[PDB]
Amino acid sequence: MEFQAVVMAVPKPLLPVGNKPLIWYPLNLLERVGFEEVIVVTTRDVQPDIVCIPDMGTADSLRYIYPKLKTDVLVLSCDLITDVALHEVVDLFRAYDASLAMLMRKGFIGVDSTGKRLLFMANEADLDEELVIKGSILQKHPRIRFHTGLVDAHLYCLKKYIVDFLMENGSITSIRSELIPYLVRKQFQVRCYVHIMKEGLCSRVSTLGLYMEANRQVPKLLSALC
Amino acid sequence: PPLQAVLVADSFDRRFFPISKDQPRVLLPLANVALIDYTLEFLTATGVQETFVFCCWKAAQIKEHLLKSKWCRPTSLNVVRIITSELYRSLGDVLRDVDAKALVRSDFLLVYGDVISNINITRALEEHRLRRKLEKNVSVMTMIFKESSPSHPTRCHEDNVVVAVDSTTNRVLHFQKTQGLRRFAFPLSLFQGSSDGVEVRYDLLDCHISICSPQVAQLFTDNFDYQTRDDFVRGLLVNNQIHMHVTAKEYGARVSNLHMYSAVCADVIRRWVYPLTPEANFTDSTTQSCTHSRHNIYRGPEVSLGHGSILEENVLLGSGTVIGSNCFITNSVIGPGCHIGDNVVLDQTYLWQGVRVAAGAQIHQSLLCDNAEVKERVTLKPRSVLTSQVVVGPNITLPEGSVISLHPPDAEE
Amino acid sequence: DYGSKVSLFSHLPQYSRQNSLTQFMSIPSSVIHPAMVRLGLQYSQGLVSGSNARCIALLRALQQVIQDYTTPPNEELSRDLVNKLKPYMSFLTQCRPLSASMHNAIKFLNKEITSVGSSKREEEAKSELRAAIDRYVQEKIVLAAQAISRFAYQKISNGDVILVYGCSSLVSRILQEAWTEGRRFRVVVVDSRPWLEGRHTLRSLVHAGVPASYLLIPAASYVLPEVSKVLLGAHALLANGSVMSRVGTAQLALVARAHNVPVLVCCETYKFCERVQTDAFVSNELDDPDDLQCKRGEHVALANWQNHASLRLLNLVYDVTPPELVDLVITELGMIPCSSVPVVAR
Amino acid sequence: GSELSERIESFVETLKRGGGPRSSEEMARETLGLLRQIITDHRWSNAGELMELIRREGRRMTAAQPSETTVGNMVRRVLKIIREEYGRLHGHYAQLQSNIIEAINELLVELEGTMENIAAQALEHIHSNEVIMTIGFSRTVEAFLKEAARKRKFHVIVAECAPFCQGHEMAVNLSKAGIETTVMTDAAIFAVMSRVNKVIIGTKTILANGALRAVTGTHTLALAAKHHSTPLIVCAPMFKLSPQFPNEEDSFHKFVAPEEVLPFTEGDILEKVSVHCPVFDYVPPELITLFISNIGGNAPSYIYRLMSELYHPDDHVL
Amino acid sequence: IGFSRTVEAFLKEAARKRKFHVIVAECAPFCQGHEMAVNLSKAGIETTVMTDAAIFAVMSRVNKVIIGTKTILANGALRAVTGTHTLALAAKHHSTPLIVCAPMFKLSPQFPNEEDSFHKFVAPEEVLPFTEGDILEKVSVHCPVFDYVPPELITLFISNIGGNAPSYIYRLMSELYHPDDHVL
């Protein structure tokens, strides 16, 4: 096929967000454009086709399920309530033949003038004082746009050789914290692209405030979803 | 209120100091026209009605040359005032003098004496005034840039800068040079203090043209440690706001070194600074008349071109020049009164007035000053500067980077 | 369709670059192979625009599809492969109209598939199909280009002034090979809005050390008197001797004839078409009219052209060139007159 | 006093450093006003010194910008008026100034009337269901089309110039009045042939042998019209008649900065690439069919006859 | 111009789908074009007819010219009815393409070798009536029915194998007739 739809989720997945389980929303989003096979990794809380496997971080589970996958893997998060069409992010991976497709929404990363290619990325913790950019990136890309108020949906379209490389080394444990920055710094062929919606929800439930905001935001989405 | 401008004739740096022992930098001819004439023409075309000229060293020559220019005629719309003082040592000194003399009363332009541009400031000044009035005098400087490519020949490594601006409202937040720098660094204040556009631009050419404010001189005088404008703009964004503007269809550059001088001269020859062209005769001088031909070939009166000579590309020839037979001149500028020999090959070579070249000489990418002489069977390597009155003999070859001057300490003799 | 078309071109589609149809499609595409949908997305986005590049990409996608194709039970491969490939061709045509090279490639592939033996094993069928496709690609592109360049090298002399228009992978190869062999000359590059594809070949010539000049098509009359020869590319060869190419070619040939300048056309034998055309109205391709907008001065004059009912924007791409304005045609088999291409093509 | 001189240098500077009035009619009107003011507030006891002064001012104006042959025509017309008045009077020295002022005023009135005179002849050469093509932006062809379209209905195709896309403004202005215009590039000019019934265009000036100077790309249009045997009618007023034959004229076209053709942000390839951006071009007289002016349509072979009256032969060199 | 069955079938077949205008030119000796004009008029085609003297006068709004022929020479020339040479000249002057649809059996492998029998002559009665008077003994009247059209005035040739250029006739001749039988 073309994607594997990894829905890694390692009773948080069964939280009553909008009178439905928290894991239902990513599953419902996936079961709207094909995706007849789904691989779900979680603990002993399991209840369209779903393949569960009780088991850690993200790269460890990806290596655990490495034999099962045979093509590109679509990494999805357990807590993700979005109303954006997946085609907007799939087109970047398809037309440009990129190695990674990423999705952000407005509330450090660097994008070019078009605002669809990822050039630089560094969190506040990694850098001590000074944000340093190599002269080569500025030579190839003169204008760089920086965004500081973006959130991450944990939606990545990985390739096959990326997973093959991740398999042989266990140093990387969290994908979001070690894999994407590695690809960003390695390309300066490896290409990384990002997509910004700027008008949707892209809500990732990870705190009490986000929990209550998601509760407020469910009903109008559900009025059209169902 | 009428528009005013301040012109700094003396360049306090010594970049052009194999040759400046006889003539100032402003009087160096680019296309047989002085750089100060180019700056005065640009100021007059942009709308300046009063220009202040500050001269520090070799002031007599500049003063006597300005009076002969058309800008000093009674029927002029741009009054030029010449101020001479031997105590000047940097731009900060002249700015403090202007502050003490109360010469300026409103927004004025601060440009050097070797700036060649055709930018008409009529919208950048308007938005600068609008944002000064709206916020009640928080913006003090509106620097002018030009969008270009980092690989352009007009972007010298000694005049390459990287800045971080706000996309919403054009305002400079960081300014630093890139001389011998590989990994540039930007402070965290921009990202962690504000938002809505913190983009970084590395495609801007420094035109060295700025729109100043009456309080800029007072800020310069308050701190008795400012010498150049770069130090002022670096120290202001340490605590008043500095904004910026970008042009896309016009041209602007300041001659600082030999490489940039050659690049600007080549751009001028190729009509990149239209309408400021050699055949336009903006100086209103009878001895600088010229006619435009195919392949950007310019010929003046009494060219006396010989038989067999080929002008392959854009060539500027002065009045009274003499050209032999079987010559080959391309991408070269020849001053008035020159006497070229036979079988002489010129490529990217600049010749001033009074230069005599013997037959069989091969000159490539060299510069010859006034009254320079070259004997027969002499080959000049690229980037070989010859000062005024050089009598280099025959059967000699100058290596790359060779400089010959009458003064003993200046390399060779 | 997008916008309103003119009366003279009401029989031709006019699509939009932003009206991508992949939105109403399943992400793990099954009705259409992922290679075809990726190729269609690339074609719509304009990533691939060369005449040979599009054919190469189409053949590569077809080879990829053949590699991962399984035969349905109780059904011959030769009887169903064409029926399965037809919707892919329809989808590709919907994304962007095809060219002569793509039509020839798909016709050759259909002929190959129909000739596959019934008793041949499926893996053998796939392997031989891939080998035949690779051999066809080789002999029709990389063996023809060398022969065309060798033939054209004899017509280039020192001191010549060659004028070229647009972007062509064959003309550029000829010029680079001629410069590398030892010929010394200069090239003239002509561009027209809004594609401005000649900048690519200008940059290629600059990086190769060949002197070049740049100007627009309205000023070609000023530079033609100093031009010695005119070299132009061809997109398709018709059965009546005419040449189909970029829209800025026929008028360039006419002006060159008015200035008494020979016109040379280089094309391959696999681009021949069994069609007869006289004008660029019976068969043409219309692009996005929004590309005609220009940023001149401080605003765009055609920002709201759709608000005017009497305002129309026309975006012709191809045109025909009469044989009277063509002097020499160079193919992979030898130098021939323009009025003798049907004899050798068929 | 000094006001006349100040206006003279202001006019010279605004002619040299850049463009002046957008329309040529306003330029001619202000040139005539400047010449009248020069004649009025100057000290001249005889006609000869007045003609010498006028010739010197005309030479200065021509040297300011030789690409435009508009001020020189006014200078030549004023000189012809001076010569005619001198021949009428001497053939004196008392009422010459009043006659000159009256001649200038009547010339200005006629120049104002040329626009209506040209526009009044729109229905004769234009019929219904016709295809008309124009290149660039012209204030005379626009008036012609708008006057002809108020009683009939036809189709107009407008092609913009590649460096200066001024045809978009013409197309918008026409479509605002319901003409059903079309916008296309210069590349698709030969393709659009064989369907156009008539060609109506303007010109900057008209040469002596019937040739004319127009915007770039007009030569290709004329060649296509000749190839397809379509008529080519040019509408131009009487002040565009240049009394100089086409010489070598290496500077006939106006060359501008290569920024319009090639952007400055191309890179390092700009140091070894020659870019030329001519504005005007030369059209041979054999490719023109009719010449429409304010006194009626005339053949290209009547240009010398039309010029002989306007300008004295001794003033051709000015 | 004239009456051609092939041209009539070509024109009447495309009238069902599209509507156009047809201009028919008569023939001065025998007005056989009027029969074609009325046949096309009784087809919903909206045709018109006129004399032979207005061929060049109305050669401005005509976008395409389709005519027949009696035979095709070895150099691509044609032998059509009289007055077709003027039509071809007008089409060339106005750059209007002239395309001729002729069958494959009208291909004659011969050249116009000054035979002088190219235009057969008939009785001068059709031109000048016998009842003119006594002036018939001095006036010499010639009534040719065919004209010579050079191949340079032909744009396309419709055949059963598709439209062919006038320069492709020799290729068909090489495969149609043996070169030893050209003399017969």
Residue numbers in the entry:
A (entry chain J): 1 to 10, 24 to 60, 73 to 80, 84 to 135, 157 to 237, 297 to 334
B (entry chain B): 41 to 279, 285 to 458
C (entry chain F): 172 to 517
D (entry chain C): 8 to 98, 125 to 351
E (entry chain D): 168 to 351
What does the paper say about this structure?
To explore the functional consequences of this rearrangement, we mutated δL516 and δF443 independently to alanine (δL516A and δF443A, respectively). Strikingly, we observed that the δL516A mutation resulted in a decrease in FAM-ISRIB binding affinity by almost an order of magnitude (eightfold), whereas the δF443A mutation reduced FAM-ISRIB binding by twofold. Similarly, the δL516A mutation strongly decreased nucleotide exchange activity, whereas the activity of δF443A was only slightly reduced. Thus in the absence of the steric clash driven by δL516, the δF443 rotamer and eIF2B as a whole default to the I-state orientation. To further test this prediction, we determined a cryo-EM structure of eIF2B δL516A. After two-dimensional (2D) and three-dimensional (3D) classification, we generated a single consensus structure of the eIF2B δL516A decamer at a resolution of 2.9 Å, with most side chain density clearly visible. Consistent with our predictions, δL516A exhibited a ‘wings-down’ I-state-like conformation. The two tetramer subcomplexes underwent a rocking motion that changes the angle between them by 11.6° relative to the ISRIB-bound A-state. Close examination of the δL516A switch-helix confirmed that δF443 defaulted to an I-state ‘up’ rotameric position. Critically, in the δL516A structure, δR517 also formed the I-state salt-bridged conformation, reinforcing the notion that the salt bridge and rotamer elements of the switch-helix are functionally coupled.
The rate-determining step in this pathway is set by eIF2B, a heterodecameric guanine nucleotide exchange enzyme whose activity is determined by its conformational state and its assembly from subcomplexes. eIF2B promotes GTP loading of the trimeric GTPase eIF2 (composed of α-, β- and γ-subunits), enabling eIF2 to assemble with methionyl-initiator tRNA to form the rate-limiting translation initiation ternary complex (TC). Using hydrogen–deuterium exchange–mass spectrometry and cryo-electron microscopy, we identified a central α-helix whose orientation allosterically coordinates eIF2B conformation and assembly. Through comprehensive characterization of eIF2B remodeling events via HDX–MS, cryo-EM, biochemistry and cellular signaling experiments, we discovered that eIF2B allosteric coordination is mediated by a switch that is triggered both in A-state → I-state and tetramer → decamer transitions. This conformational switch is orchestrated by a highly conserved helix that is located at the core of the eIF2B decamer and facilitates the hinging motion that converts eIF2B from the A-state to the I-state.
